[PDB]
Design a protein around this ligand. Structure first.
Ligand SMILES: CC(C)(COP(=O)(O)OP(=O)(O)OC[C@H]1O[C@@H](n2cnc3c(N)ncnc32)[C@H](O)[C@@H]1OP(=O)(O)O)[C@@H](O)C(=O)NCCC(=O)NCCS
Lengths: 388, 351
């Protein structure tokens, strides 16, 4: 079968910092010299983090650490009665900023290139806004994988969101409970399963029969839990009210949030054959990044799981790129240039000049201040959902 | 695909609401007295090699001198939508066995069940021994799965969300991301586990075949009780005709064959299903290789690891039909002249 410790997530690394919410993983360098500026990974909290580190073939973590990047990662902890009152402000505070400060203290570097996936892109961009409000110089690059900045025009998720349940949870906002992985599966995992199966059958109609990706389904079936305040806040303020398009309509961590302020070069990727959330909704966000000096958009060939994770060592499908950014997405698609092989290479190039010069890889994991606690994958990833 | 193949003669000797019994015209002077029954899947056209378009196997074994009968399941009609698995056991296998024992005047018979049909036979056995009904003296399973632990690629698709989605079916801007059991995927699973030839999505059989015409209760029962629950390996997990299903209660010799290159049915899984037939007096497993000629592997040892069985297996070139012929000939009784009439007086031959 699939054991997390043994045949998955085998990318060597150590837990160099642990929180009451997260577990930072510094991956063991596999190159002689790495890029000086580190690379932080912000995986989603809907499911578990290891979609980027499945098998050494399709392990994006092992790949990018194999290219020469100081790869760090945020491992989210499944919900627990200890975390019943956690909110979005805590996932920004004790989540993103904690790991960022930890990387700054380990690598002794000021800036870092960041990457957000699914919901980790929303947490990432909110952390970028609070990072531009308080003068916190943490990131010099940003990247968003299949994440929605504009949540108006959402996906099929709206068909499975209960307004009365969100309101009833707003009635008991204080001392909130814990959202079971079953419901989050009804809203996310099941639909990604439908799109993965459908797109797999389609790819078996176009090309010859390809081996079925059981690792993807195993990542999708391994569900975690989430606190009630943060999840209810997500369903209320994003997938319903959509407070990201209205500057100042939302306020967390004592800060109002406007997207135009972000002045960090942004790279955005969005799967094309993504039926659960069409790529037009993801492309409908770059027009709100007016303050960003640089912007990039890349169309991914397959679905959410299959297209989000395409290994370079395989180079299975293509991707579309062009610098133009019109208001209509079809105008972007017409003047788009197609490139074979997986899209990661492109982002690799997009990170080459930003990562600065090269520096010999640190032959010591962690630091004198942060001792390696336990080897990767760690403990939080091995958590099991709470029984009924 | 431009096929030039022989026809196998046979008349209909028994008919009912669900099946049709076909008695094949004997071509040997002296045939074995004990008859031989064929149990295909509960599908009129399964498109399995050597059987559906050509039926070379029945022709060969009638050539070896056997009184061969076949259970031709009728095509799906609106009157068959209410049948269940207990009906396919009751009016399906047992009724055909009664027809054979009345036409041939012989009490017992040798049973053969390939593909999903074999599974049916299995369940039927666990009912017969439970009700004291003596129908079969031996059973044979060809490319059939008793232990559904490792179904193979099809496990990527089958789950409760799929079967529940198809049970639902049976809305202005939503795509197929909310309809899992669409006709494409559902037909891929059904055609993938119920047919000996897998049609391409651009084929007419991919969308209109007998497997898609099978009643939904049968698909729910097979996908849930077997491919999801694996109720066969667990004693008493399912109850059919008011009988708990215990594989250890099979008291007849068992022969099992599984093609090595069949990626639909892993021969390691069919071999895995052997350790659960502890009550059977003897078990013989034979692995068959297509040869890109033909050859097979025999081993009378039965370890738990399949690769260990293959390591010590003796390779015999040719068709494995010789091996099953030597395994089946002693259990077929003496030799009697061939019956010049198909069926009997009380059972006149239909058309
Ligand atoms: C036989 C099998 C391995 C073919 O796989 P394959 O290599 O893809 O070949 P195809 O399915 O395209 O079949 C190709 C050949 O088989 C022949 N063929 C296919 N079905 C046939 C049949 N029912 N009878 C006779 N010949 C057949 C043709 O020769 C065709 O062309 P070729 O001779 O030039 O190769 C595959 O069909 C199979 O084994 N299916 C088993 C079904 C099953 O396991 N069912 C579960 C029990 S129902």
């Amino acid at each position: 079968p699939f054991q997390i410790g043994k045949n998955l997530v085998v990318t060597p690394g150590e837990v160099v910092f642990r929180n009451e919410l997260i577990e930072l993983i510094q991956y063991t360098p596999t190159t002689e010299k790495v890029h000086e500026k580190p690379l932080l990974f912000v995986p989603p909290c809907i499911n578990k983090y290891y979609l980027m580190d499945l098998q050494p073939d399709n392990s994006m973590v092992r790949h990018f650490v194999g290219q020469g990047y100081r790869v760090f990662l945020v491992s989210w902890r499944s919900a627990v009665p200890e975390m019943k009152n956690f909110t979005w402000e805590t996932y920004i505070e004790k989540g993103v900023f904690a790991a960022a400060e930890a990387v700054q203290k380990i690598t002794k570097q000021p800036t870092m290139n960041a990457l957000g996936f699914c919901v980790g892109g929303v947490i990432l961009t909110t952390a970028l806004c609070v990072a531009q409000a308080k003068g916190l110089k943490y990131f010099d690059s940003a990247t968003f994988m299949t994440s929605l900045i504009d949540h108006a025009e959402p996906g099929e998720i709206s068909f499975f969101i209960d307004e009365a349940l969100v309101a009833s949870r707003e009635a008991k906002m204080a001392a909130g409970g814990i959202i079971s992985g079953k419901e989050i599966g009804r809203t996310f995992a099941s639909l990604r399963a439908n799109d993965l199966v459908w797109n797999y059958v389609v790819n078996n109609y176009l090309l010859g029969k390809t081996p079925a990706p059981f690792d993807l389904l195993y990542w999708n079936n391994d569900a975690v839990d989430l606190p009630l305040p943060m999840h209810t806040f997500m369903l209320r303020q994003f997938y319903i009210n959509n407070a990201l398009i209205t500057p100042g309509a939302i306020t967390l961590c004592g800060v109002p949030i406007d997207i135009s302020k972000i002045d960090i070069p942004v790279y955005m990727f969005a799967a094309r054959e993504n039926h659960i959330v069409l790529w037009s909704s993801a492309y409908s966000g770059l027009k709100y990044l007016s303050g960003t000096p640089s912007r990039r958009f890349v169309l991914g060939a397959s679905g959410h799981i299959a297209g989000s994770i395409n290994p370079v060592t395989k180079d299975k499908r293509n991707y579309w790129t062009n610098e133009q950014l019109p208001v209509n997405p079809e105008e972007w698609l017409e003047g788009a240039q197609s490139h074979p092989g997986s899209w990661w290479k492109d982002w690799d190039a997009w990170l080459a000049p930003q990562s600065g010069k090269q520096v010999p890889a640190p032959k010591m994991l962690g630091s004198k201040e942060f001792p390696p606690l336990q080897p990767a994958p760690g403990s939080y990833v091995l958590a099991k959902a709470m029984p009924p």
